[PDB]
Amino acid sequence: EGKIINIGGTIIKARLPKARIGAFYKIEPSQRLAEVIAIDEDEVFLLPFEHVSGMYCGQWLSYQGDEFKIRVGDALLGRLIDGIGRPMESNIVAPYLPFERSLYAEPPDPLLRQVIDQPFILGVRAIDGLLTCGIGQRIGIFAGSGVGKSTLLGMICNGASADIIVLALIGERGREVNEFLALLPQSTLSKCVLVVTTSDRPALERMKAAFTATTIAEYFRDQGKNVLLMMDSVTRYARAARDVGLASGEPDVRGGFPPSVFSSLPKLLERAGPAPKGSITAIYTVLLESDNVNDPIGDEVRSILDGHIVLTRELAEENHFPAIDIGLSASRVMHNVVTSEHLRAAAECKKLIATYKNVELLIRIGEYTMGQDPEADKAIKNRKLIQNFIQQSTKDISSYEKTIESLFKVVA
Amino acid sequence: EGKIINIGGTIIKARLPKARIGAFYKIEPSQRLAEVIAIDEDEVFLLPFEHVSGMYCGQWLSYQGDEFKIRVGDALLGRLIDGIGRPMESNIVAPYLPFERSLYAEPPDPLLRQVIDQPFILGVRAIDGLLTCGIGQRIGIFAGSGVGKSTLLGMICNGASADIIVLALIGERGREVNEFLALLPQSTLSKCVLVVTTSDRPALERMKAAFTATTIAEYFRDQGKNVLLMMDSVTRYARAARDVGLASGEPDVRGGFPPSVFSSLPKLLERAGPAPKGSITAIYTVLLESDNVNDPIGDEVRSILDGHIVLTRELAEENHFPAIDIGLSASRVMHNVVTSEHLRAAAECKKLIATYKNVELLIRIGEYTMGQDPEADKAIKNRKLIQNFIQQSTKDISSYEKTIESLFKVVA
Amino acid sequence: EGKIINIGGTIIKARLPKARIGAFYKIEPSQRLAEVIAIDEDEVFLLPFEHVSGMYCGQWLSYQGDEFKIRVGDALLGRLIDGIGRPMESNIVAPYLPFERSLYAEPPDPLLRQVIDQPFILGVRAIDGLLTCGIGQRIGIFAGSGVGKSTLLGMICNGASADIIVLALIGERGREVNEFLALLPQSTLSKCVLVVTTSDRPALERMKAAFTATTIAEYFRDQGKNVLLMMDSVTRYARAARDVGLASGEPDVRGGFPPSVFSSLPKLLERAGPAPKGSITAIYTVLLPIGDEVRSILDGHIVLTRELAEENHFPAIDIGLSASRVMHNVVTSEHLRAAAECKKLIATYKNVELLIRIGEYTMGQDPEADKAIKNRKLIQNFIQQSTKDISSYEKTIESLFKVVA
Amino acid sequence: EGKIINIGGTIIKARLPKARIGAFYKIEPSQRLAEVIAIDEDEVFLLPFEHVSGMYCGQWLSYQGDEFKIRVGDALLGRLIDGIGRPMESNIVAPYLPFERSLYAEPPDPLLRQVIDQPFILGVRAIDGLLTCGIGQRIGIFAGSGVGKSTLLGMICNGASADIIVLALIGERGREVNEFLALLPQSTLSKCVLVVTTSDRPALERMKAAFTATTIAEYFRDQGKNVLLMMDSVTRYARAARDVGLASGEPDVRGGFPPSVFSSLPKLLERAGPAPKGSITAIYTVLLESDNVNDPIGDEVRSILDGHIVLTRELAEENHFPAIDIGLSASRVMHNVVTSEHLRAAAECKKLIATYKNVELLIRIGEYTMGQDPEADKAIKNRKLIQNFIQQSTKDISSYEKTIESLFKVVA
Amino acid sequence: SLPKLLERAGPAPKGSITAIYTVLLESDNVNDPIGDEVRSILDGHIVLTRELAEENHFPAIDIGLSASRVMHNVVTSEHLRAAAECKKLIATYKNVELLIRIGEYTMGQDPEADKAIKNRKLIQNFIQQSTKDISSYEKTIESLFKVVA
Amino acid sequence: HMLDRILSIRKSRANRLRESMAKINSQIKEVEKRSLLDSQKRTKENLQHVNKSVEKLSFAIKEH
């Protein structure tokens, strides 16, 4: 059909007359895949990802279709899937996947994507009492390393109020995926779909894994369920998309990232919102470093999402699990999700926490005693029960009405 | 009329001669369009309206009109428009829009523009009291990501008293269409045109929505009435123009940006403003890419607008809402629209906020004695009255008379 | 089989049809050789190993291969090998070598990595009393400059319970190969097969030395033998593969390294683990940008510090911030908890020596630091010994159990 | 045998079909030589030995040699040589050099190098008492501009005890050749060879003086005697080779430098050292671009060289000469050389210098009670003995026994 | 091409052009390439800072960063001395400003710091000026002599 | 950059004056205490003096 003309290291050219763009091809001697990214007159540029050094001048290509698809069906509940869309395991025969979806879809009509008003019950008393999620809210957890991101993340997986969970671990090593999917039980994995790819996989698969998980969750949305998508480490998606964009040839504009990363984040994670039939509540994670406090992916994800959680290292150094810094973190759709008395209670508890930080640094200074500030004294005497409300062990799962009841207790 | 010889991901090259620059074409086996960016001898470089991911080499371009023009009439009052110009509301019938006009018009004559001296009531108490606007100016709201821009536009749209309100939501979170639409009453939406494009839409439509919103505002200006143009993230226009310019082979000159961005911002931001017949008052939001006001596109937009409001995260995390930094924000018609005792009182309140910010460490650790500097004494005395004057809720809209009355009360 | 178009300093261009990337061709009049980095439609960018002087327009290129494979057999035990594979010296004659295998072999996926058992004894009594290591475990050593790591490597070659010991001096200095081999006996050299290469040598064979040593160690893995791989200065492999990468043409991403070394180093390191044929214990040294990427990729870091090596406490390892991640799957529960309580008995001395540098600390109620003061010297001569002081595994156990008393 | 087709600034290009690399040609109208550095299949890049005064197109070339060789011999002592090889003093009669050698030889067999065991008495108290050099060690001196690299080579070269000294002054001021001959006594000037090239000389004399000095050093090494080679700014070789190769069609890689610099510098810089008969001991002055840490030509010279003395100008600003930062400098070959008590004394007083460099702050800030840190109490008492042991005058050279005696009485 | 614009505006054999060029800096840094080059061409620079615009000190001229090349040929020796001593008072207060803001300054150690603290308000309402206000040159220099001592 | 180093001394001075405060508060229970409360009184006013010395030195980093 067409043969390789040259190999330029990471990008190859091949003569195919009237080849379309977005298509994917088989190298005929091996079984290797490569897509088309740029079209010339007769001699298309073409991006491989797996292996380059086994290539001649005149090695043949093979056509499959116009756009890359995946096999999606209702038998995926409890499967480790490749990021390109294949079942990784060989212990089971791949079941009946009837439908045929592409990875590039579009979000719904903005006049059909309507306002979110219902709460998303979560089990964690800090994310649900003081902050509050909504069914259609895209949370972003901004964590470091060693603060307890995965323990909180498994607490989200287990105690959620969702019907189908769709995890996505983009850049990982095998010990961490085994540690994390060994951390959540079989009652969780009987409803969970796992789109797992690791850091040894090539960059195209680590980029397509987010599209794969979003397409699985759009399918389980379109039958009318409350899907909970969990992209783990959108930072590593961004690193994969950086490498693909720089290998395509593209000038970096901010922090070493090409414009394709910054233009492909919104059309990735704007798909995961409310819909006219069912809805998807997504929760993304960003690994913030002390090396770059600037971190353009963190700023753009904060600019696209709506409601961020910050896991600080100080609240991990003193034993405060989960290490959620209330007041440094917030949710945007809370004022139209919770009731009015819960909204005036939760603001007073955050104001008590900030007032306690100020009053401890003014009480070790020598210039405080009890009686000349009423807002201070109530925070002083409510310190330990606020700390018993925020802190929560891994196997202590609470309900929503118990959380609101204990919150109304802990404010007054 | 001509074939395609290149498809490069953003710019497609077509071998078709005698093409006028600015003209647009239809890819005739589809229903998609493309606009001529540059020409060669017979090899034009043009930019598609929709995405590029379905095209191939020999694919014709039939000739369309010589310039892309939108259709505008009086029946746009109360509608939902895209950046191309076509209506979003499908269930609402198609209006009769008798006039049509292109998106690239010149500003008024610099002598026929007039010195602006009538105040524009915004409803926000801080801007009205310490800063203030004029009917005709172009103020701008500079902030980081998630600091309070969209909230302040909603507050300032419930507060404003214009004749026509043209709201452009450019490159923003698609959920928020119905939220901006549900914070407005019906008598406001009966006079409100709403141009909505989304962050998923390609780099032309997210770039060209500013010009169709400004063209609709110029139409209702030329009918002879004072209109209000609120634009949400002109920096998304700036990012779209960066991506189109760098795809079209232009050098980086500052911070990631080509010179075409810095040359194309002033004509967009300058065709607003005063006029011989009517006036459009514009309020643009600017997303500073870190939490710094000296971003490249933030500095370039600040050197063009006349009046700038700076929101800072250091007051967002202190629950000082709205987060208007009184120091780094200024209005360039303040001294021109208002009387002398209001100007004196506003300047003195700004100065005594600064002189409290001089002292507050000596108050915190208990060192400042009372009677030695009367300016700092009056600062410490009137702090709580000021920060009951500066903060206000989103539901609290205050008229201009009570604003200047409480301003005289608080300055003493 | 192809004429040379031009010479671009370190890049040759040739006119030859149908060659694969990585095929190595032969300068026929001078007996030098050069492998392919990129092909055009008929011309081919390749790069020479050796120096480029003496070459003209129109030299021939003999084909002689399509990918480089090393002539490896059972008779390489006790011989000096270049990073390419040919011997170093000419005093010895090359013996019979029946087999040859290529330098590439795909590792198993990380989702099904095996369990570790069967304690592997290195010889230094400090770690196999405190931070033990199994057969298929791959270990990273994070040491500095002038910390005495060469004696450590020579004494964990001397006293290891492995039938084959393979080491790759990849990128070493001129004197340092004799400086290293001066402290290996003959009973050790008759067990070693070892690859050396110097900074004189081109970056192409300085990065193929790692694949050569890994491939030879995989060959001796398949014969039912327990084999130990050593790669000294993985960072020098990293800078060599960097020089090959941006010498071929590639922009860098992190530090100064291209992403090709970030695609090749997990491929080089992810292999060489617990196979069912009797497996391959890898020890990889990294000096103190990519140490994060190495330290997050293999199980077990050993830290040698100058702040400890300024005294005469050799081997210069500090147990308070090094740990091998698999000990409960290796050593028994008694030995594990006794080793961990000796670790926290050492770690409480440095938080109480600084408080007994000042005159304040007494006894009376602190049951963990009062024991360190009396039982300090048994600790501090348990966790150090000389270069040719061997301590077997059935002595350090009861020695450690009479340390805890 | 060919015509010259263009003249650049540094480079010549000609049409010499089937010409070898290294083959040097002379220009037929104008007597001057030029050697081939690149091929472009019909069209060769030559580098001339002199300036380009009158160079018309089509100027002829004539075959002279296949490689460039220099005349060496034992009758070369007490003389001055340029980078090419010819004597530089002209009032003297021309000597008789018997043999010829090419400039490109290969380093010795690493299995046949000897083992460094005995010290090289250097003269400076710091690089004898703290960083002892062995006979056969390659050390380098790393500093910025005018920090004291050449003054330290004056102190070394004055008090050097080697059997024969080859001093290479590569690409530096013509003024200072007499200042080096002013501190060479007749006993060490009767056995010294100065290979001097000045910074105004053309590119390949400045590029080949290092090879000429190493060729002379290998000749007198192969006679059987140990020889001190001292290169002054091998960075001048590095940027001469940068300007040669980068203007010959070769890409920027790390600092403006081609790959050929990083290919040809570790072969030059390693053909010194031990040997089966004799030993070159080498001291390489290295100039740094900035005073930073990411210098593309300082870092890899630091990596491929066994021992390095780091001069920092922050000690040259407080007038602490020689400006050796003993924490930043190291000597890998001293633990094999000195006795064990010498190692203990060196490590102890390095520890004392490192302790006083931060106990000094809490002496000025009045927070240091005596006795609470005894080691610091030992680092304040012996501050003056250390700071007379470390820095010494230029004309103050001291023998090895006085250095070890003074080291012992400083540590005790 | 910037020196062959800026050098045409100066003294001349008949007539003169005194020119005043406004220069916008690409950040608040004065070491912008255009700011640096136009500072190396022109005969005097008046650097306005944003710190003094935030402190409501208008006009926001930073006196230490400013200079005027031709002043020593223009003013008398007494006026040049008074200008230099007033600029040294401004620099002394900028030295002691953060030390008195933290709270370590007790009145009495330095003789120049008490002079700076005492003449602070006179210097401030000399430098600070409203937009609709103009001074004559004799009132400016006599107010300078009254402020400086 | 060395002003970051000074509060590391100032905060460590605070820890070594509140652990000494815990020394006297542990031995006000056993008793001499009137002669021993003379030491905690100078301790706690110095601990207030050291805590004031940090909060005007940790706030002095933001001013630069």
Ligand SMILES: Nc1ncnc2c1ncn2[C@@H]1O[C@H](COP(=O)(O)OP(=O)(O)O)[C@@H](O)[C@H]1O
């Ligand atoms: N004036 C205000 N009063 C109270 N909260 C506010 C105000 N402005 C912003 N916020 C907080 O910020 C969030 C919305 O910020 P927004 O202005 O939408 O950020 P952006 O400017 O990036 O769109 C809300 O969740 C709200 O709690």
Ligand SMILES: Nc1ncnc2c1ncn2[C@@H]1O[C@H](COP(=O)(O)OP(=O)(O)O)[C@@H](O)[C@H]1O
């Ligand atoms: N050991 C020293 N004692 C006194 N002054 C020195 C010493 N070394 C350098 N200097 C001073 O520093 C300057 C740099 O000296 P030099 O050795 O020429 O530096 P370089 O050769 O590295 O440029 C000289 O002008 C000299 O006065």
Ligand SMILES: [Mg+2]
């Ligand atoms: Mg917004």
Ligand SMILES: [Mg+2]
């Ligand atoms: Mg010098």
